[PDB]
Design a protein around this ligand. Structure first.
Ligand SMILES: Nc1nc2c(ncn2[C@@H]2O[C@H](COP(=O)(O)OP(=O)(O)OP(=O)(O)O)[C@@H](O)[C@H]2O)c(=O)[nH]1
Ligand SMILES: [Mg+2]
Ligand SMILES: [Mg+2]
Ligand SMILES: [Mg+2]
Ligand SMILES: [Mg+2]
Lengths: 104, 286, 350, 49, 51, 46, 49, 360, 14
RNA sequence: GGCCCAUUCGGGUCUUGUAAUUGGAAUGAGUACAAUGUAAAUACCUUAACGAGGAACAAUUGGAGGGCAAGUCUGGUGCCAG
């Protein structure tokens, strides 16, 4: 299993590596470097989109899940296997829909 | 694969808790609610159980020994002021969120929650009052269930929401108040980034040290020398004077002088140190 | 004697040689389960070292170094306090004191990522007063909302986005990056009304002493003589001297036809020659895109509620809409800027 | 009093800002400027990019 | 021109008065529908799905 | 003169950005792809 | 449409010719210009043949 | 108001400490009684270096030049070039930048031009092998001083590039309560615009003193020839004693003057390295001022550094007094439990300094 | 290009 | 005009569409007078009055496609491509 037996993995956000990419909503912009807390290994994960990139800032707790791709996409960056499903204990989709506020 | 998932939940971001190992300060309990929701009566009801002494009038912070090594400071936030709702939100370790069950949620109840969430979420307890105003049990249950679930959106799911029926002699039921005192004792406080990085203190008394002669020879317009007392929180405060400090609603000032005084409401666990229940003499109020 | 001389003092060379003929004197010199637990062990160890050392120090020495530790009941004396604080003192309203770090003392431009609160009814406008709550302090500022334009420049926005974050720049006491905050427009009870009073939410991203917000400025001219690619334009500039400054500049039409400012025409003043990739029409309008700097207003109005007698009707600079209503001024409007329905006739060619 | 003195200064500062928000924006601030709209020979001094 | 200006100002003043009509006479402020249900941003859904 | 400087600066900035974006994309593909393939074969071995 | 609000996909209304230039006619946009360029290239292609 | 200092003494440190603390300072009575009063040219240039790497700072010099008022801004950094006056070498200006570079908004990429060596100031190899390693111990992972061209006195002509790629919140908490074990001795013998025999004659002289030791000795011969050899003839040697167990280093340096024997300089510097080792406990005397400052600006924790009885000199005291005037921090010295030596432990509590200029 | 993004400056009155 | 099949060209079939207006009936959630009930009481059952057009008395979740600007960015072999 990618997370050593877990379906989801806790992590610490290190940097938003694609913050300076010019093209909006690019694949690179949606990538964030995360350190798994269980073993300290650094990995790369996908944010749902640039809108969700605002909610993630450095040093938060993030729950990661495997990123499954049905078919090849032109702009995808293969190798990124994880997507952020929660930040600070709150679902990104809930924040993205303005149904919750990130507690700090 | 539950074991792996359970082990994951134990993991968090490593943080530094600046709470001192010995003689920690009393925790600040902020009683927030719309006007007339029962802030004052709840504080009197809680203090009476914890101390057995009833206060006819309450003004400013009230410190009580609620446990063998736990002290609490109750503060009644003005319900008509938003500026107050901000600065307590930055220092309150616990928040007793009062909700009028008959009326339902109000703006200021939601406004405080949003302020707290952005400035660092503290522990929040929901307390529902005015439930005796309901005439039917069926509608009361539905109203209670609706309030709890909306409350679970603002605060983590499974958050405790209380229910208080009515007031007798300006006091809530003795048993229900007992449960409130119980959940306050078991609850655990996590560190916050901003409270663990600055020193702060909620003033217990206020005093003017200006000579009365100066007030006359020059006039009341003259600036005043003031001494302020209270428990220190957060990181240690530097001993030497001249440290720059901010008083909410007043401005920035420099500490002219500072000294430590003996604890006015010392915790019993310290005194005995110099399975067993708290002694009746041990519980104090300041 | 002094640190400007980096090299330290040494004895005379012959003395050192005799001293160091023999080198005997200096011859003597020559598991936690998870990564999470390893970090926590590192924190606990350092905290343990702090406790051990402070115990070794004297009680007076300890206070001198670490200072008054938390839990201490202390008396703090202040001078030059306003008299209104003593007179208009209400014990119901708490007095909260917070220590300040060195950065909090400094004043400068604060760069933050800011969004209109989802429950707020209206969007926020640039240069519109907003009461911010940073750290221990509350104050009113005039923020400027900006966008990156695909990470090329800091372009000034007119309003906050309806449902997303935007960069904001405002002048105020500097705070460490990653400090969250919230904004309100009204704090007085008289103006409270019934709506939600939390206006903006955001986080500070950077602190600076200066910023280079810039606003798009488009120069507009019109063609009056066209020869296939080449055309003569008017009303863009007032004199030929200005045109020479912009010779070689990139221009385009509304249709998207790109061109260049070739030369300034001698007669009349301000007219100039341009060449376009394709023939333009008389109805077309040529545009020159240019950028003009914008300045942040240095306005600082701390919220001193406790000093006032009322403590709940603090009022500062009003909103633009409120200002217009007081002086009975119509909301500025440009008839050309309004949108109308456009019906297109079918296009036919000879 | 000192508090009263700075309140007067702020009141002066508020008054001028209230007038600026009312006042018509400078030509450069307005989008889509034209030769007639702006003052003559303005572009020479402004040093645009 | 003054007649047109007075008409525009009066129209705004009437609208502001109409908004002020909404505020309840009683002091208590109740959360509106948006805050209560907390539906957030959702797509437009057909009424046929309701049953 | 000013036109010459602006064009050269813009070209230099554009080239660096493309090199920088290419670098971060290539390194991510190589290092994370290796772990992706390395994990996938163990699942195949299982 | 995945992870896109309906607010993002909001119509941007089209502007019109200025009143001062109303005599010259309809303000051509990119789609209008494409009709001109395509027609001219078609005729020039046949003429060249 | 202003923290007031007297004289030209500790000019760079007082300016550097003010920048790190953010507290404005005033320096007055600078060489009042001299025939040429006020600041020196290299001091004015150093201030010009400060304003180029910070933003919002106000530096006003009196009409007579004997008083300076400094109101520090925020450390920004960036890419720039500095022309060092002949009066001082590059190391006089590179050294203070080591205190500020790791806590900057943007990376420090400064190009220094001028004389690259002197008798009183830090050399290129002293910075590269003696000071920068101390920075690496404190958490500055990536720092580099490239020697593009060497310039010997008097005509100089050298060029060096300082690049500190690591930006950090603050130096880590230090813990070294032992005497590091020296495992080997390394060094660089360099020469410009002269025959290669001179650098070899140094190593013979230096090896003569150090051959009695029980460790390996390997001194580099970095002869500079061609366009990059500067404009003047000169030579010098730098020896570094290394402790790979914890990456500690002690070093000695000196250059040669006209008419001086290369063998003597190799012998003199070799003797000084042993004297420095005898006077050191955990860091050299010339590294001590650097280490202490990084302790002061650390996190709110107790760091521990072992120092020798000899290292506490007039220079050491004036450093601690200046720190207290700025940071109000007190260095607490306690004896070690050992009887073989008279070492103390200097325990300092950090001020919780943080790099707030860096955007997040 | 040097003066574009600076606010301070060494004010020498000698 | 709608719909169906078909890679292709095309082929097959007929009451369909409204993003139009409009009428009177039905009743449940709720708002609730009672009796019955029970040691008393809750609850159950039974039962007056009121209770619908945005029937705003305002269930959601997920997926597939579009389209728009005097807008922004990138690569080019004009007006293009992403
Ligand atoms: N019926 C009923 N009345 C209650 C309840 N809790 C409070 N009250 C009444 O509410 C009134 C106000 O109580 P307070 O304790 O003064 O509440 P408060 O928050 O202090 O009000 P303010 O200080 O004026 O802002 C009192 O007359 C109480 O009798 C309850 O559960 N039921
Ligand atoms: Mg009360
Ligand atoms: Mg729910
Ligand atoms: Mg009908
Ligand atoms: Mg439903």
């Amino acid at each position: 299993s990618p997370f050593g037996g877990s379906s989801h993995a806790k992590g610490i956000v290190l940097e938003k590596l694609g913050i300076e990419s010019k093209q909006p909503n690019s694949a690179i912009r949606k990538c964030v470097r995360v350190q798994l807390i269980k073993n300290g290994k650094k990995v790369t994960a996908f944010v749902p989109n640039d809108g969700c990139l605002n909610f993630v800032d450095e040093n938060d707790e993030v729950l990661l899940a495997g990123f499954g791709r049905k078919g090849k996409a032109k702009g995808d960056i293969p190798g990124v296997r994880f997507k952020v499903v929660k930040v600070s204990g709150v679902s990104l989709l809930a924040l993205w829909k303005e149904k919750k506020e990130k507690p700090r | 694969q539950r074991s792996s998932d359970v082990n994951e939940r134990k993991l968090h971001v490593p943080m530094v808790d600046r709470t001192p190992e010995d003689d920690p300060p009393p925790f600040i309990v902020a009683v927030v609610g719309p006007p007339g929701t029962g802030k004052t009566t709840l504080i009197r009801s809680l203090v009476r159980r914890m101390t057995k002494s009833t206060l006819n009038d309450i003004q400013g912070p009230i410190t009580v020994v609620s446990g063998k090594h736990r002290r609490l400071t109750f503060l009644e936030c003005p319900a008509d002021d938003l500026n107050a709702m901000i600065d307590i939100a930055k220092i309150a370790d616990l928040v007793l969120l009062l909700i009028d069950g008959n009326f339902g949620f109000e703006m200021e109840t939601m406004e405080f929650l949003n302020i707290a969430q952005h400035h660092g979420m503290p522990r929040v307890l929901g307390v529902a009052t005015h439930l005796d105003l309901f005439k039917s049990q069926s509608t009361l249950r539905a109203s209670k269930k609706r309030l709890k679930h909306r409350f679970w959106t603002e605060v983590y799911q499974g958050a405790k929401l209380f229910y208080l029926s009515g007031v007798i002699n300006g006091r809530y039921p003795d048993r229900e108040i007992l449960n409130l005192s119980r959940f306050i004792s078991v609850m655990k406080f996590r560190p916050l980034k901003w409270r663990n990085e600055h020193p702060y203190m909620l003033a217990d008394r206020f005093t003017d040290l200006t000579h009365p002669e100066l007030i006359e020879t020059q006039g009341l317009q003259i600036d005043r020398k003031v001494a302020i007392y209270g428990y220190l929180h957060g990181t240690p405060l530097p001993s030497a004077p001249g440290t720059r400090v901010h008083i909410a609603g007043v401005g920035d000032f420099s500490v002219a002088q500072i000294e430590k005084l003996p604890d006015p409401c010392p915790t019993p666990f310290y005194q005995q140190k110099l399975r067993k229940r708290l002694d009746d003499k041990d519980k104090l109020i300041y | 004697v002094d640190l400007e001389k980096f090299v330290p003092y040494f004895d005379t060379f012959e003395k050192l040689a005799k001293k160091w003929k023999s080198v005997d004197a200096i011859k003597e010199r020559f598991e936690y389960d998870t990564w999470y637990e390893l970090q926590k062990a590192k924190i606990s160890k350092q905290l343990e070292i702090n406790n051990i050392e402070y115990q070794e120090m004297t009680p007076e020495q300890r206070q001198r170094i670490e200072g008054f530790k938390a839990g201490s009941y202390v008396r703090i004396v202040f001078e030059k306090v306003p008299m209104e604080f003593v007179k208009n003192f209400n014990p119901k309203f708490p007095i909260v004191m917070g220590g300040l770090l060195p950065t909090e003392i400094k004043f400068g431009i604060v760069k933050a990522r800011l969004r209109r609160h989802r429950w707020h009814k209206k969007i926020l406008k640039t240069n519109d007063p907003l009461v911010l709550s940073l750290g221990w302090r509350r104050f009113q500022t005039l923020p400027i909302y900006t966008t990156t334009d695909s990470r090329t420049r800091t372009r000034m926005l007119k309003y906050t986005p309806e449902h997303t974050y935007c960069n904001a720049a405002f002048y105020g006491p500097l705070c460490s990056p990653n400090t969250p905050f919230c904004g309100v427009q009204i704090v007085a009870n008289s103006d409270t009304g019934n709506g939600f009073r939390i206006a903006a939410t955001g986080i500070v991203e950077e602190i600076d002493v200066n910023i280079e917000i810039v606003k798009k400025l488009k120069l507009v001219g019109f063609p009056y003589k066209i020869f296939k690619n080449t055309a003569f334009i008017k009303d863009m500039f007032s004199s030929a001297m200005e045109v020479a400054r912009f010779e070689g500049a990139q221009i385009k039409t509304v249709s998207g036809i790109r061109g260049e400012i070739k030369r300034a025409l001698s007669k009349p003043e301000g007219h100039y020659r341009a060449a376009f990739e394709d023939k333009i029409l008389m109805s077309d309008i040529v545009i020159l895109r240019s950028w003009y700097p914008v300045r942040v207003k240095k306005f600082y109005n701390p919220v001193t509620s406790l000093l006032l007698k009322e403590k709940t009707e603090w009022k500062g600079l009003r909103l633009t809409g409120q200002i217009r209503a007081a002086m009975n001024l119509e909301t500025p409007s440009n008839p050309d800027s309004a949108y109308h329905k456009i019906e297109r006739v079918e296009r036919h060619f000879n | 009093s000192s508090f009263e003195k700075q309140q007067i200064e702020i009141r002066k500062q508020i008054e001028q800002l209230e007038n600026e928000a009312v006042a018509e924006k400078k030509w450069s601030l307005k989008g889509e400027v034209k030769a007639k709209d702006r003052p003559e020979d303005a572009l020479l001094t402004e040093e645009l990019e | 021109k003054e007649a047109h200006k007075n008409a525009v100002i009066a129209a705004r003043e009437g609208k502001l008065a109409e908004l002020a009509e909404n505020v309840s006479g009683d002091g208590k402020r109740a959360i509106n529908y948006q805050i209560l249900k907390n539906k957030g941003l959702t797509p437009k859904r057909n009424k046929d799905n309701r049953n | 003169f000013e036109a010459r400087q602006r064009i050269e600066e813009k070209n230099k900035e554009s080239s660096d950005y493309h090199a920088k974006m290419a670098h971060i994309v290539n390194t991510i593909n190589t290092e994370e792809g290796a772990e992706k393939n390395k994990y996938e074969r163990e699942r195949k071995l299982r | 449409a995945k992870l896109v609000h309906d607010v993002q996909k909001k119509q941007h209304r089209e502007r019109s010719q200025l009143t001062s230039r109303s005599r010259y006619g309809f303000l051509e946009k990119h789609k209008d210009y494409v009709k001109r360029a395509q027609d001219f290239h078609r005729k020039q292609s046949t003429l060249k043949v | 108001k202003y923290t007031t200092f007297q004289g030209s003494q500790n000019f760079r440190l007082r300016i550097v400490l003010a920048t790190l603390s953010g507290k404005p300072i005033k320096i007055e009575k600078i060489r009042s009684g001299d025939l040429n009063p006020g600041l020196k040219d290299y001091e004015v240039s150093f201030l010009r270096l400060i304003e180029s790497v910070t933003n919002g700072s106000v530096i006003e010099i009196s009409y007579t030049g004997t008083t300076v008022i400094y109101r520090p801004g925020i450390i920004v950094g960036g890419a720039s070039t500095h022309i060092c006056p002949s009066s001082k070498p590059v190391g006089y200006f590179v050294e203070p930048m080591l205190y500020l570079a790791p806590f900057s908004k943007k990376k420090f990429s400064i190009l220094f031009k001028g004389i690259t060596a002197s008798h009183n100031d830090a050399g290129i190899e002293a910075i590269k092998w003696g000071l920068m390693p101390v920075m690496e111990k404190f958490g500055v992972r990536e720092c580099a001083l490239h020697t593009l061209k060497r310039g010997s006195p008097p005509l100089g002509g050298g060029e060096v590039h300082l690049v500190v790629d690591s930006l950090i919140a603050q130096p880590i908490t230090m813990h070294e309560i032992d005497r590091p074990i020296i495992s080997s001795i390394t060094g660089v013998a360099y020469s410009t615009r002269v025959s290669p025999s001179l650098v070899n004659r140094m190593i013979d002289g230096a090896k003569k003193v150090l051959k009695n030791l029980q460790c390996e000795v390997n001194i580099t011969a970095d002869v500079w020839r061609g366009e990059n050899s500067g404009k003047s003839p000169g030579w010098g040697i730098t020896l570094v004693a290394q402790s790979k167990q914890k990456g500690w280093s002690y070093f000695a340096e000196d250059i040669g003057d006209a008419g001086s024997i290369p063998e003597e300089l190799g012998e003199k510097v070799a003797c000084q390295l042993l004297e420095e080792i005898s006077k050191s406990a955990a860091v050299g005397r010339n590294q001590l001022p650097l280490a202490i400052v990084y302790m002061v600006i650390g996190k709110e924790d107790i760091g521990r550094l072992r120092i020798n009885k000899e290292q506490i000199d007039e220079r050491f005291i004036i450093l601690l007094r200046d720190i207290k005037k700025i940071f109000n921090t007190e260095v607490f010295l306690k004896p070690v439990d050992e009887a073989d030596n008279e070492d103390m432990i200097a325990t300092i509590k950090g001020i919780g300094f943080t790099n707030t200029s860096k955007k997040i | 290009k040097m003066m574009k993004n600076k606010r301070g400056g060494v004010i020498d009155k000698r």
